[PDB]
Each structure stands twice: as structure tokens, then as C-alpha cells.
Amino acid sequence: GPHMEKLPIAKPNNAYEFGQIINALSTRKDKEACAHLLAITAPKDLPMFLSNKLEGDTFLLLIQSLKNNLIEKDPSLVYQHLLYLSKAERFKMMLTLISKGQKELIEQLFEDLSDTPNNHFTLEDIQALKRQYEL
């Protein structure tokens, strides 16, 4: 990960802005600046941004950003980001291009949410939504 300073983030207004920030972080491998991007992004806007500007590495970046950073800030925002991410179309191509040992990271994402009892979601809601990820 680069020692040279991080590029500053203003919120994504539209799919190209979301994609152009994210692809810069996929260039730096930045999970922590990606975590700031989810801390400012809405789950409702997220699948509309991911429409055409969604790739294998940029999907995996946000997954590793969730199962490390956002789980310790708000696991219910992780749950809602994963809920609306399941509505994205190109999302379903990603789970086919990802290798089995890299797909396990998506399991560890839900395994950390399973560990958290929460005022916004339940295990019943987890085990229902994870089905859209075929885990």
C-alpha cells in the first residue's frame, strides 16, 4: 500500500463519480479510504452507482473494506450495503470471476454480522439475504 498521500474524497454524486473514486482506491488497494466512501454513500444509491462501473477488483475492494472497517463502525450499515448490493446486476458476474479462496472473504463478512445481535436486523434476516450471494 502506497506511502504517498491519499487522494481526498468528496461524496459520490453519480455512478461515474463513485466508479472513478473506487477505481483510484483499487489502484492504491485502499480499504480505509474505501471505508470512508461507504461512511458517506447511501445504500439506496449504491446499486444505481454499480450499474456499468463495477469490476472484479472494485467489488472485492468494498468487500474487504466492509469485513474489517465498517463492521467496527456500524455492522447494520454493512447489512444494508450488502442488501442493496444484492440488487446490482454486474454483482452476479463477480461471484463467478472470483476464485473460491477469494469468495471465502464474502463468507467471513456474513460470519462477522452473524456474531452481532442488532437493533436493525436479525439472524433470520442475515440467512435470508446471504442466499442472494449463494454462500
Count CA atoms within 13 Å of residue 88 on its CB side.
28
59 occurs within a structural domain: yes
The length of the chain, given as a count of residues: 135
Is 9 contained in some domain? no
- What determination technique applies here? NMR
HSE-up (13 A, CA, CB side) for residue 39: 15
Separation CA 50–CA 112 (nearest Å): 24
The residue with cell 445504500 is 43
Q: Report the candidate in 87, 70, 3 with the shortest Cα–Cα distance to residue 31.
A: 70
Provide the phi-psi class of 56: left if phi over 0, else alpha when psi is between -120 and 50, else beta: alpha
Q: Which domain holds residue 119?
A: 15-133
Q: Give domain status of residue 40, yes or no.
A: yes
Query: Residue 6: inside a domain, yes or no?
Result: no
Q: For residue 10, tell me if it sits in a domain.
A: no
What gap in Å lies between CA 38 and CA 21, rounded to an integer? 12
C-alpha cell of residue 117: 445481535
The three-state secondary structure class of 35 is: helix
CA distance 17 to 131: 30
Q: Which residues precede gaps in the chain, with C-N > 2.5 A?
A: none
Number of domains in the chain: 1
Considering the domain boundaries, does residue 96 fall inside one? yes
